Write a protein that binds this ligand. Structure first.
Ligand SMILES: [Cl-]
Ligand SMILES: [Cl-]
Ligand SMILES: [Cl-]
Ligand SMILES: [Cl-]
Lengths: 225, 225, 225, 225
């Protein structure tokens, strides 16, 4: 699972943090390494830096690494750092939500002044959604009719089931997750269309990325449109 | 308040129900009268009719009037009956969610085989949203950034505060409500764009309807197309 | 995982269902097998039987096996069937909530006219909670202070984390789960005390049951008192 | 409604705050005045004091008066300040939850090193629960069986309905509120018994106060012991 490349991008990403910044703390294994680096760098350099978490996980990690936490209802974010399940090469469109936290991730990431994605090179894809389903957070009363709508749109949609709870996985917001495989022609339009299905709260297509840091065997390349 | 006209429309609407149907049970004063009529009809004619609620209000009234409730996750709705805050005369577009329940309302109403709106004549308007704000259900962590997005779209947005609970009104789904006055040029497109703001769950613009029953002093008229 | 003994108990349990009943549908592998048997019986005998689910799992299985679902807010349950993580041999006290659904389970199971536990023989224990921790559903804001409370009570408490969603496991009600090992010397009082910790929603000690059906190699035995 | 008395208690209460403390920020009109006073004192004396909110209201007010906010999952509370609907004179037992926020209030207030209640003189009563119902926060699926349980206990239990939303008032936690009139013979035991009803999250009886500051025409008096 490319941990050395993940750590490499985390250590490079943390250099972008400046004293006085409010930083969005992403979710997933790559973000988690970044949160540890930020925690270290805050302590060792006596920085005044606050974090806004994108999940209970990010919140609990921040606490462990002693990053002061604030909320988006109180502060704007200077830079949001987050991972991705896929990054489309030519567009820098993402699929996120493998970890079931795409809703709070999007809220922070799209609202930050800058949104930086942190990935190892294996996340790069030629075609978004070819090999990874789109996560969709759904109001529980609407699961059947959202599966219908997604199926009408050409998707193969399945409810995400839990490993440590019986039945559907539940998000930090109390909703279910449907994962849907789609042939994505126009990712911007598809993101809009899925969100307009009654019962859909948010989906894992991200189309507003400022830049992508990619850990490779050679180093860290930056991608920007 | 037009109670006479509301009762008239409810009494006429209940005649559309056929034995064996699953009926969507709307929310608000007019839908409440309909639920009473439906319960009375089920009793007096011994119909086998089930209901699917759009709110905890609808669930409680169904209990009170002995309408057996099933779930949208198992059954499609033959006819959904619901109220509206505004019905635009030329388009039959609606604003709903004055009572805070537009999200579950839309899940039921848009998915019903037939969606029938029940209003008294006072709800008819020349221009949608000229005199009533659009309810928007919002993930609580996102309220500040959603207010910003709505303001940047030209809206006057205010968080709805409560009287029987201190602070923000909370929906049946656990979220907050922002009410936003907007100049609605293209209702179909605005509905879509509001839903694509991160942190927005659903909004009160409704642009799909089968027919609108309107209680007037001379009787109930049916609007369609 | 004793699938023969679980299937055996499910097949015997379904015989207790009578035409016209409302049946509580439990959660977990043994309950799932019962739900299938029930659906088969309803179909092959053309029974008029309704279900009330204890979880999103039970809801989905009821859909799959064509059991019409109603609500506890409208109907009482004739017989609730559910599984257990442990059944104490002398008292028939249980631990439930291994699958994270103990809160809704307890709501249904304690209120049913008859509550029937279904287990294979491996679930029988000499001492409740010696080898299995008590699940505790917790308001997220409270997890730290609940860990403290449970520790004061002599428990070793740990937040349940997931792998299909990053971070804490979230219940069907949107809360967290703390699992706590305790030396249980009065189950009835411990259940009551845990529930009086601020931030605790419900716990997995069950001290009310009508009978326990146990699948053994020599047949299904029935335990009571 | 005794506004000058509330103000005078708030002004006296704020003197109890010391630099470096973490303070619990209560809910309701009297607490809101306290929050204003605290915000003023933090700014004017350049205190390093943090607040932990007991509601979305308290969080919103803190932000408005620029009190830095932390969470109970991160920090313990030195002093929690909160209001009350009733304060029984001889015992200092309280009823809280008039504003629908008793659950988060109890989580903070019971966990504080010191819990201070702020009331005007009109909140003092001879007998707890004689003139005011006990708020009870209830899992929505359980409202009928919880009404039943409370009624079996001798209570007159009624669902609290909203005025700025249709149907049941919903808490910050996404649950319903049932208000129940009871003849309270043993408050400590009743608090425990109500909490052990399946589907009850928390109730408004509070039995653990350190002191009560009372606003009277003459001044502010401290009740303790
Ligand atoms: Cl995620
Ligand atoms: Cl509404
Ligand atoms: Cl479970
Ligand atoms: Cl309150």
């Amino acid at each position: 699972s490319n941990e050395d490349l993940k750590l490499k991008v985390a250590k490079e990403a943390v250099k972008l943090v400046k004293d006085g910044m409010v930083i969005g703390l992403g979710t997933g294994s790559t973000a988690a390494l970044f949160i540890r680096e930020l925690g270290n760098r805050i302590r060792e350099e006596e920085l005044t830096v606050f974090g806004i978490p994108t999940s209970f996980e990010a919140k609990m990690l921040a606490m462990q690494y002693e990053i002061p936490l604030v909320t988006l209802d109180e502060y704007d974010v200077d830079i949001a750092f987050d991972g991705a399940d896929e990054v489309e090469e030519t567009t820098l469109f993402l699929i996120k939500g493998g970890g079931g936290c795409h809703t709070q991730e999007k809220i922070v990431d799209y609202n930050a002044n800058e949104f930086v994605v942190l990935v190892d090179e294996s996340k790069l894809v030629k075609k978004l959604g070819e090999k990874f389903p789109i996560p969709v957070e759904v109001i529980p009363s609407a699961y059947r009719v959202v599966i219908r709508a997604l199926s009408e749109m050409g998707g193969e949609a399945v409810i995400r089931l839990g490993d440590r709870k019986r039945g559907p996985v539940i998000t930090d917001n109390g909703n279910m997750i449907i994962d849907v495989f789609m042939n994505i022609d126009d990712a911007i339009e598809l993101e809009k269309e899925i969100n307009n299905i009654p019962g859909v709260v948010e989906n894992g297509i991200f189309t507003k990325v400022d830049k992508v840091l990619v850990g490779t065997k050679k180093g860290v390349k930056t991608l920007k449109k």
